[PDB]
Symmetry: C5
């Protein structure tokens, strides 16, 4: 009884040229693409890339594969995939992509009576996500994913998303888990491109990333903030304690200096200043400014002691107020 | 005499279609799975993954392979595996998996008279283990391992564990060795899932991990604890020793600051506070609070010296008591 | 109707030897090469290499592939590429190169009636870019890319760029994005080389890189600059404050020392001094010189106090002026 | 004349089934194994693994390959290896193994008239070496190497070492070169194991490793030792020099703290204390104890000055003596 | 006309056994080897390895390939290489080697009328270079490269260099570029070896490496030197400035301590002392000795002040002289 299926499979490959697209010289081959993101892999800011694992499904029509039988479908696997024609889909921005071959190549091939073909493949892509770290770490990124044909122009093969955007791209609930980003949502689009070899259609999927702050607060902001507060303690000491106040100013300045170095170790080596860098620079100014006040005070503590006390006493109020005022401006500016 | 075996092997492949599952159009193919964990590889907290090496065995039934002969079994190897039908089993959460091909592909294939088939394979998986590091390092993790068919829905192929849980998954005595975790035990389960391509059965194996503390005690807690004790020594010095007490407070504060940075270097860049972070923050408060006491004392050591001595003398008792009290609360809270 | 195409493909391979170049014993095979740089990958200064992803296109002529049919072209893919002759092009300076095989090998093959052949391939090269870091970080680099035949000398196969330089090599707008370099432009050239196996033609593409300063300003120059300013503050303190001025000098000297170590951690281990190293050395001299002034002053503050005050007072003006003067010379020298 | 050899090779494969072991249904296949270690690769303590490159030779008997000819042997290569039966030998503890394929697969195949077969293969294994770092760095490790059949039980295939232990496993003179270990010697053994699939024989080779101390002496012990001596210098200063003695105690305590962190950076993150950790802890106690002496002395330098001098004077002798005494106990204990 | 070549190629493979070496049972196969080093890759001191990219050429004689035709040579590629016999050459000390397969396998195959065969291959080897870092960084290393047959003993296949040493091994002008070594020259040699499988001839190429100092001067020596000079400044301060002189001694000692740790981070973890280590140890002694002088001086500044001044004054001359004297001995000793 099972032998019925075997004959059908042999019949389909009879007089079938895997080197020719369906509808050749008759129409334009139309491919419907849907994607499921099993896990949105890590985002390497330094490399401006991101890893993603997907189940890439392509559907099209091939009248050469029509058949009649008891079943309306023919589940299969990678065994028969090489024997027929499949689109030469590739990822323009994919720096390095590989498939999964254990235990068996994660591929599927299904055929219906009408000739509709479903080809599902599992992939792990490593794409490039250019980023503008001007508002870092309060930065929103739009990491794209582009794919299309490599040899079939828009006049031969066209890719279109299936149904609406939600059904076109799907992300698993546990997949949207990252240590430094939030996956706000996804969008899809298409656009033709003109090249030397001809016009091609490009399918694009954009992932909206909202950086989840809180690691940098515990890593950079708080040490910078507490270091500033430490420096202001020097204003509560007597002027004659030259050695004591010197330690506060010197140690704090160096501490802020090393924080700038440590902070950017993980950050990419971008040739421009980020929001965090500005915060550090201001914090450096406060600690450095406190040291200057002590030096200026100690330089006139003999000639005009009266003014020195006023400056030292006044500084106990001005510095905390300005730093608190700056934080409101800084946080409000980048959080709104 | 040996030629008898050769004829049987040739006979089996006669009229055998490797593209068709057994029982097609007659019943549902049933697959029995057992696992042996040779070594539970390292767990990368930063990557939220874990490596595992297993001997993956699948058993099923295929009447097309029935035979009669002197032997009740036909030991074989990977040579004949490609010639017959095997399930398209794959690991949903496996980021990257590879097999072992030295000296020979670590595969086995055994067949009985009744048609029962045993397919054993050796694998090294790299799966993803999401973790909630809220109680870190007193955190218990449940790293799963999911697998199932890629192309055969629940109506065609079903995976079931063999015998009880203990016989279904086995871990070698030396395999359950990790530098930062204890492998408390294992559990298995099944659950259907609905997808666009149809309903599939998912087989899940969970490994219960209990982090073995002791590295962080020697790395973070003790330096934090001894640093606090160092700061309290300043209370035993005279107030007039402004420079001396300043060194204690300043150095200790910076020391705690760098410990926070160093501690999280290995830790993943999670955007929330762990139990260890709270311990550091408290330790930072104690050292910082000690410095404030000296500053406050030095600010009134002239106007009201009597109260300054009381505060300095009293602080010699309050600070050690509170820190000791906090540790009991902290350790008891996270150890119960 | 489609069967017409199938016959043509079969006819072409009839009596076709893939082991023989076209024009053999009749003329010299001529290959036209064009390149498109999808993304100019990262430049590793330490490894003196750079990654690049390109679409490498080669065009030539083969009379054995002439055909007549309704279409003037035969779009194809990697399936037929192995069946015909293609040049043995390789990259002399490519340390490690690999192709992209997902979803399908990123290859194309097109044939015209006259026999013209177009072979397009996608590659990710890792070439070596020797650099002279004498003006670092104000250094301009010329990273080349060499390719040619491996077995066919200049008397058999010749590579020539197609059209002008602009059309020969093209760089995508988003491809020319690097964190520490600017892609000023590109140039191409050819040159024969003589070897033991014969004379070969070498095609070279040079990429002009202008390092984008700004990361090192925030990383090395500013900490060095502010550290110098910190040291000069010691001149505004009284001589009798021996301990205070000692802290300024000692801490600053050590701070500059560690900056030299930290700065070169990312820099390659080159056995010569860069421009940045000279800047650090001068900054080290200023901080060190300030300490000597204090030591010299403290050594004669008793015998001849009058001169000590003059030196300390004078140093408040000389040191800032010289450092400012040096910066103008340094920046102007390396920026012009 | 050479054609004689060609006929013999063709004759051997005539009626030869590569899927059947020799002696099947007649006897037990016996395999003689010898090993030559070209280079004992690096030992990664963190990963508890070790790399090794070997020439793995297996010898057995197959009457199906008997032949008569002028020569008593038939040197060959990997070309014919796939055409005959070879044991499915694999390494149980090998996490990742690969072969060498340049310029040609490093394989050999030799056959004698009697049917004796020699199969030599070159491998680079990455095995797991569990270690007990309780006596670290005075620790001796026994890194094993296990191999056996994957599909042929003890009733079908048996592995036995050839000749004595010395001839069974051989290590090249230059191979036994490691930066942190001494290869004292090797031992071999066999042992049956019972599994679900049947009983198998396991061949084990153990390498005895004696860690070569001297890197940790220059890295950890000496800095710890000299830091302690530095602290004891504070006892030779006057009590009134509160600031001076404070610097000694504070800096030394922090210095020991960072050494503990730095020391364990390379060391694996084991959740227990090593011998080196105990040495550090004692060194921390000495430096910390010295600071307490100064604090205690400074706290009673007014009420009872006489006793303070005795304690300070006495400490100049007690501390050096105890530290020297401890070292003898520590070194003698772990070196005997 | 071109069909003439096709017939010759078919004729050559007629009755050709790729499994048999030429001259079998008639003579000894003789192989002439020449090498061209495109780029002498990086040398990893930690791994005691070095990467190298070469064009490996082997020439021999095979009378079975004689032919007559208009041309005296038959340029070819990897297509025909597998169809004939090639030596099983392999690299004994090559830990990991791989070939280049883009755009086409970098292989060549040329045949002359007389039967002479040229086989050229491109390789990227990763060999092991044991080193004795006793004179480091003034160390000269001899990194070898060994290759020979894997299955053909000296009685069957012999490797010999072609022409003189200069023509046998060639290094490209730009290839001999390293960041920490100079490629002084190359030498070649041969030597038989006896093994269990028989006697084999080994071809060895040695590369003489002279480390280019200058990175360690800027990284270790200068910071060590300037740190010593910093300590000697303490001798120019008054004895009563106890706190000031303490900072000099304490900070300098710790600074030298961390330099020892930092210096060896890149250096391999060898269990013996290098020349640089001795230099550091002496520098540590000078800074430590200076601190002892201050402590000794401060301990007798009351009982016998006169001698204290002499020691402090004398030390201003002795210490600089000895350090300068030591450098001449150290540099002259290791530079001659
Ligand atoms: C599908 C295909 C494949 C091979 C080629 C090709 N063949 O020989 C050569 C020199 C090329 C480069 O032809 C291109 C390719 C891409 C683009 C383009 O529009 N981008 C924008 C989107 S992107 O993802 O940044 C990639 C670059 C322009 N010219 C053209 N088309
Ligand atoms: C067996 C199979 C393979 C290919 C597909 C498939 N084919 O084209 C497309 C777009 C898909 C995605 O279809 C899926 C896949 C998985 C799930 C699901 O239930 N998860 C929960 C457990 S998990 O391990 O996190 C993986 C995700 C949902 N839809 C479906 N099923
Ligand atoms: C195309 C080809 C391939 C195989 C060989 C070859 N075959 O056996 C052997 C020993 C060689 C080395 O023959 C060479 C190779 C290259 C050069 C040369 O001119 N460079 C300058 C430009 S480069 O990119 O730095 C590479 C080196 C000199 N001799 C020669 N020619
Ligand atoms: C030769 C072979 C290969 C496949 C299997 C197998 N097939 O399906 C399944 C579930 C298994 C696991 O069967 C095992 C395997 C090994 C052991 C054992 O005795 N160890 C001790 C030495 S070891 O090197 O640590 C490896 C573990 C126990 N059961 C059994 N034997
Ligand atoms: C050509 C070949 C290949 C396979 C074998 C072989 N086959 O089964 C086994 C156990 C061996 C090991 O046989 C050896 C191999 C090498 C040496 C030797 O002389 N060295 C010195 C130079 S070296 O480069 O350090 C490598 C080691 C000694 N015995 C012998 N000869
Ligand atoms: C691409 O070209 C086709 C030509 O028919 C056109 O219909 C389509 O709108 C184009 N796509 C875009 C985004 O312009
Ligand atoms: C999956 O579906 C089958 C349908 O027969 C059902 O018997 C089984 O209980 C289902 N599994 C679960 C976990 O619900
Ligand atoms: C290479 O050789 C050919 C020989 O015809 C010559 O025409 C060409 O100019 C040469 N190229 C260069 C750069 O000299
Ligand atoms: C393994 O089993 C065989 C059965 O004949 C026995 O002879 C041999 O001694 C056993 N090996 C060990 C180590 O017990
Ligand atoms: C190797 O053996 C051959 C035997 O003929 C001999 O001629 C040759 O000199 C030997 N090589 C060396 C280096 O001894």
């Amino acid at each position: 009884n099972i032998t019925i299926f075997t004959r059908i499979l042999d019949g389909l490959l009879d007089g079938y040229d895997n080197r020719l697209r369906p509808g050749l010289g008759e129409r334009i081959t139309q491919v419907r693409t849907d994607m499921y993101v099993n896990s949105f892999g890590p985002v390497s800011d330094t490399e401006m890339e991101y890893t993603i694992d997907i189940f890439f499904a392509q559907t099209w029509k091939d009248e050469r594969l029509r058949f009649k039988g008891p079943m309306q479908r023919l589940p299969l696997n990678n065994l028969l995939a090489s024997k027929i024609w499949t689109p030469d889909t590739f990822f323009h921005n994919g720096k390095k992509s590989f498939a999964h071959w254990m235990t068996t190549p994660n591929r599927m091939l299904r055929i219906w009576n009408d000739g509709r073909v479903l080809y599902t493949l599992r992939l792990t892509i490593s794409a490039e996500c250019p980023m503008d770290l001007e508002d870092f770490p309060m930065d929103e990124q739009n990491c794209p994913l582009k794919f299309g044909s490599y040899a079939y122009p828009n006049s031969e093969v066209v890719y279109v998303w299936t149904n609406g955007s939600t059904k076109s791209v799907v992300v698993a609930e546990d997949g949207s888990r990252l240590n430094q980003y939030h996956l706000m949502g996804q969008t899809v689009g298409t656009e033709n491109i003109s090249t030397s070899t001809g016009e091609y259609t490009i399918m694009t999927a954009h992932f909206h990333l909202k950086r989840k702050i809180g690691y940098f607060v515990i890593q950079t902001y708080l040490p910078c903030i507490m270091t500033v507060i430490l420096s202001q303690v020097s204003f509560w000491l007597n002027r004659e304690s030259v050695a004591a106040r010197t330690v506060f100013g010197v140690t704090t300045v160096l501490t802020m200096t090393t924080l700038s170095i440590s902070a950017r170790n993980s950050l990419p080596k971008v040739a421009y200043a980020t929001a965090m860098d500005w915060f550090i620079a201001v914090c450096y100014a406060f600690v450095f400014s406190a040291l200057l006040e002590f030096a200026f005070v100690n330089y006139i503590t003999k000639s005009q002691p009266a003014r020195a006390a006023k400056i030292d006493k006044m500084s106990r109020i001005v510095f905390p107020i300005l730093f608190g005022t700056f934080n409101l401006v800084y946080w409000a500016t980048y959080l709104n």
